[PDB]
Design a protein around this nucleic acid. Structure first.
Ligand code: MG
Ligand code: MG
Ligand code: MG
Ligand code: MG
Ligand code: MG
Ligand code: MG
Ligand code: MG
Ligand code: MG
Ligand code: MG
Ligand code: MG
Ligand code: MG
Ligand code: MG
Ligand code: MG
Ligand code: MG
Ligand code: MG
Ligand code: MG
Ligand code: MG
Ligand code: MG
Ligand code: MG
Ligand code: MG
Lengths: 51, 96, 213, 148, 202
RNA sequence: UUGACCUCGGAUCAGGUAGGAAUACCCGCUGAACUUAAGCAUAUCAAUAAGCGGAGGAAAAGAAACCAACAGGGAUUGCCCUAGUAACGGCGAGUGAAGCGGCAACAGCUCAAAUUUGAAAUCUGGCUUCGGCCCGAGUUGUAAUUUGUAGAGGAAGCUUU
RNA sequence: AAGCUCCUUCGACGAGUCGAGUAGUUUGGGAAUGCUGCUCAAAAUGGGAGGUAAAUUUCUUCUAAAGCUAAAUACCGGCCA
RNA sequence: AGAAGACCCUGUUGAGCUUGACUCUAGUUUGACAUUGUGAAAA
């Protein structure tokens, strides 16, 4: 049937908690390498390029 | 309003505003033309059979029986009471 | 077929409900189309605001009378006091409600000043720009910095009166003489016994006292 | 998720967890609350006392807005004062001011005297008040304003 | 105006004058036919207040229907259901006899639009009604904004769908609290109360 | 004898219109039983399926003989909530709304009931189309004013196309 | 020809309808929510409603028995994506 | 071998038929009101 629960209601606050964790995890060199990115020549993990 | 939650005149105190009512509330007011036309038709038409029975009862001074008969024909106590007074007036007009 | 310490079910699913199941998969699609309709209406209505001015009304029950909201339209008493003809207000973005009645001067006064405030900020272009009339806004007064929606600027500002007032100890209000609890108990008893006291006033003995001189 | 289920665990075993004797039939016992007085009586008398019968009088057009009167216990009176203002009164900074709350602005009608109050005088505007709520307000030096 | 006088007279249906006219006209309508054209309205006031004008395009018909309730058109008393449905005699039709006369006239003159209708007489076995119809193809009707709304296709056979005054009464289209089940349509309201609405996020 | 009027007819008279299809959604009428109640008859399934009539791109409803009891809201429709609640029910199984509140949308109007009465000022049809003319309808009332929010008659002032 | 302020004068407002009884059906609507059949059958500050039947006295809110009107809503049957 | 015994029993499974089983019903009979009006005679 098309009555099946296709969409999931996630609490706003667990979405924001996870988004902050994802941003924090983006600032760790081991977590970039363990994912599979080629960051061997990146000076600092929060790579900020002048706008 | 007394400004209290309970009591006789309970309610928040406010300044009442006095204004003439809506014109739609003026319904039920007998205009002079309507009363004139209804008098002409009343003479031409006459009386319903049940009205004539009540007037006979009223003339014999059987007021309770006249009201009971008027109630059964009309349906309600209020309409019967109003009709009996109306019939009592037309009796008076006929006998000057 | 109850088996354990359950809550007794209340599932009204015995009437072939599967034929009348409405699933809202077009919630996102309807929202996008509503915004497209709103944009088209605004473009056609420019430079007029997309909505109409509405009065402040008080909610009609003891549960909600503490709060005010927006009404349907301005009553004829409010419009007449503000100095706007009844059949001119709809042409300038004002909502008219002939059914509503004003029983208090306070609510009437609050809506009249709102009508005058809107009238002050309103610019009316001439029916033909070549020859402006008395009631048309002059060319210099027109500026071009207009507003999109009236209800954003003319919404409710304080729907519920604040409860954070602070007063000097000198201005401390006095107490109820018999006690506020007793004031409520006495008020309830008066309403409960209003008919009994009136019946005995007016008593058969009082009528007998009236009869017996 | 279907992979976390006994159904995936019963694949291979005949009865699928329902027994060889006394198998899983359609409706052995009734459909719904059937037999609440006859054969499901031992369940209703045990877990749902008061189910059968009729108690009280009727109310034909009950509007629940008439019965609207949210309560507020005086142990939470000072929580309606803003944080910056509540500090000076509670801390003991005796002064010439006294707060006025006007409960109805916060969505309350009656005031009940459960907790305790600091001896700071305070003015409250309430629709209803209880005997003890008034008594504990008076002792603190407060004032009760009955409003509508 | 003379129309105010006759309206007041028409309320005196028990008077000698009105009773005589009702009796004589009842005899005349029995002889004529069941559905037949009427040259002019027999009650000019009632026709006028219902929307009748004296010009081309407005047509009056007199219709006749049989009084009494409805008998179930089953075989010889046999209803093969439960005891609660074994009723043949005292049943009643959910529409009014006025609508039945209104609808039969519409079928015969299926090129006019029924405007409204009104009771004109009755006897033991019949009730007599007059039906006001409008011809939407007449140039005198298409040119009058007060009536040319009926030319639109949504107004075809409004007597069959219940969009006339007598039909709106039968449906229960009134604003009060006594019409809760039928204000917006009885079947529309039932379908709304019984729909199980499931949103994307539950 | 002739000419009217009323009613009822004829015509392959001049000009038109209806039917049938479709019916997913919509407006009505009619109308079950299987099933649940661990039996069954009220109930339930269901004011549903089948049957019949009628429209549209939507339909229907719709500008209160409304809701309320308040410091009052103010046409209709739809969503969320009210609420599995008030209530109904072999008071069993079961069924079951509405006011208020937040929002989407927003729009108001036309008649009858008045004497143009110092002027039927109104309209179909034919011819002419060049302005108009000629039959007919209509005074048992077609135009203009008025619809309760009012309005009409006043007499001063301002203002509108 | 249209408005606006003013107060005196008026101020037509829908009948086999409203309402009542009874029968059937329907409803959450329970001394009866709606509809329909039959019998009776109104009035002018009258009438209806104010969720317990009735009598008495007040109060509140609307103005039935004539009509039109777009949007928000339904629907994948038809056409196209 | 052919056929989920057709005899028997169980099922809160049926159907055909019967009757003074329980509950109804077409039809019919009787009464009331309407259709339904106009006179005369007594009591
Ligand atoms: Mg095992
Ligand atoms: Mg097994
Ligand atoms: Mg088992
Ligand atoms: Mg066993
Ligand atoms: Mg069963
Ligand atoms: Mg069973
Ligand atoms: Mg069985
Ligand atoms: Mg069907
Ligand atoms: Mg429509
Ligand atoms: Mg809840
Ligand atoms: Mg049901
Ligand atoms: Mg009954
Ligand atoms: Mg039925
Ligand atoms: Mg009933
Ligand atoms: Mg309509
Ligand atoms: Mg063998
Ligand atoms: Mg076997
Ligand atoms: Mg057994
Ligand atoms: Mg059997
Ligand atoms: Mg017997």
């Amino acid at each position: 049937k098309i009555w099946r629960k296709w969409h999931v209601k996630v609490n706003q606050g667990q979405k924001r908690f996870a988004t902050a964790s994802a941003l924090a995890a983006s600032a760790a060199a081991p977590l970039l390498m363990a994912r599979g990115h080629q960051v061997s020549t990146v000076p600092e993990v929060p790579l900020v390029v002048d706008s | 309003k007394t400004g209290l939650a309970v009591g006789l005149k309970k309610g928040h105190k406010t300044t009442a505003r006095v204004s003439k009512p809506r014109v739609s509330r003026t319904k039920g007011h007998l205009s002079k033309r309507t009363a004139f036309v209804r008098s002409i038709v009343q003479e031409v038409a006459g009386l319903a059979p049940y009205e004539r029975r009540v007037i006979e009862l009223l003339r014999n001074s059987k007021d309770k029986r006249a009201r009971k008969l008027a109630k059964k024909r009309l349906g309600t106590f209020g309409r019967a009471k109003a009709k009996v007074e109306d019939l009592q007036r037309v009796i008076a007009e006929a006998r000057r | 077929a109850i088996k354990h310490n359950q809550q007794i079910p209340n599932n009204h699913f015995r009437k072939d409900w599967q034929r009348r199941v409405r699933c809202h998969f077009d919630q996102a699609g309807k929202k996008a189309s509503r915004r497209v309709a709103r944009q088209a209406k605004a473009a056609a209505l420019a430079p007029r605001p997309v909505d109409k001015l509405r009065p402040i009304v008080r909610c009609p029950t003891i549960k909600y009378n503490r709060r005010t909201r927006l009404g349907r339209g301005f009553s004829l008493a409010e419009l007449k006091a503000a100095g706007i003809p009844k059949l001119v207000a709809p042409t300038i973005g004002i909502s008219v409600d002939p059914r509503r009645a004003n029983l208090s001067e306070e609510s009437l006064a609050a809506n009249v000043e709102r009508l005058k405030a809107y009238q002050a900020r309103l610019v009316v272009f001439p029916r033909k720009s070549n020859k402006p009339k008395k009631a048309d806004t002059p060319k210099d007064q027109q500026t071009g910095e207009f507003v999109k929606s009236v209800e954003a600027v003319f919404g409710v500002e304080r729907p519920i009166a604040s409860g954070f007032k602070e007063i000097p100890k000198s201005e401390l209000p006095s107490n109820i003489e018999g006690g506020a609890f007793r004031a409520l108990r006495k008020a309830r008893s008066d309403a409960k016994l209003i008919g009994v006291r009136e019946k005995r006033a007016k008593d058969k003995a009082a009528a007998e006292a009236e009869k017996s001189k | 998720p279907t992979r976390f289920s006994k159904t995936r665990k019963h694949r291979g075993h005949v009865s699928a967890g329902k027994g060889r004797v006394g198998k899983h039939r359609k409706h052995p016992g009734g459909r719904g609350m059937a037999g609440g007085q006859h054969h499901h009586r031992t369940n209703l008398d045990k877990y749902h006392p008061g189910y059968f019968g009729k108690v009280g009088m009727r109310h034909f057009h009950l509007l629940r807005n008439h019965q609207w009167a949210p309560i507020l216990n005086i142990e939470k009176l000072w929580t309606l004062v803003p944080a910056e203002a509540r500090e000076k009164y509670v801390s003991g900074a005796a002064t010439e001011t006294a707060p006025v709350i006007d409960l109805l602005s916060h969505g309350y009608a009656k005031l009940l005297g459960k907790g305790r109050l600091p001896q700071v005088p305070i003015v409250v505007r309430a629709r209803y008040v209880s005997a003890e709520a008034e008594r504990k307000i008076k002792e603190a030096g407060g004032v009760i304003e009955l409003v509508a | 105006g003379a129309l105010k006088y006759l309206e007041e007279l028409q309320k005196k249906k028990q008077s000698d004058v009105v009773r005589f006219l009702l009796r004589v006209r009842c005899w005349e309508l029995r002889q004529l036919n069941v559905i037949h054209r009427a040259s002019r309205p027999s009650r000019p006031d009632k026709a006028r207040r219902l929307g009748y004008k004296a010009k081309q395009g407005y047509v009056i018909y007199r219709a006749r229907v049989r009084r009494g309730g409805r008998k179930k058109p089953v075989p010889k008393g046999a209803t093969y259901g439960k005891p609660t449905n074994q009723g043949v005699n005292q049943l009643k039709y959910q529409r009014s006899l006025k609508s039945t006369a209104e609808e039969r006239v519409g079928r015969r003159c299926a090129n006019l639009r029924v405007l409204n209708s009104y009771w004109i007489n009755q006897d033991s076995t019949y009730k007599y009604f007059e039906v006001i119809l409008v011809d939407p193809q007449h140039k005198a009707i298409r040119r009058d904004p007060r009536i040319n709304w009926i030319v639109n296709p949504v107004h075809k056979h409004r007597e069959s769908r219940g969009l006339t005054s007598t039909g709106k009464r039968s449906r229960g289209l009134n604003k009060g609290h006594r019409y809760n089940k039928t204000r917006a349509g009885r079947r529309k309201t039932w379908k709304r109360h019984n729909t199980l609405s499931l949103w994307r996020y539950r």
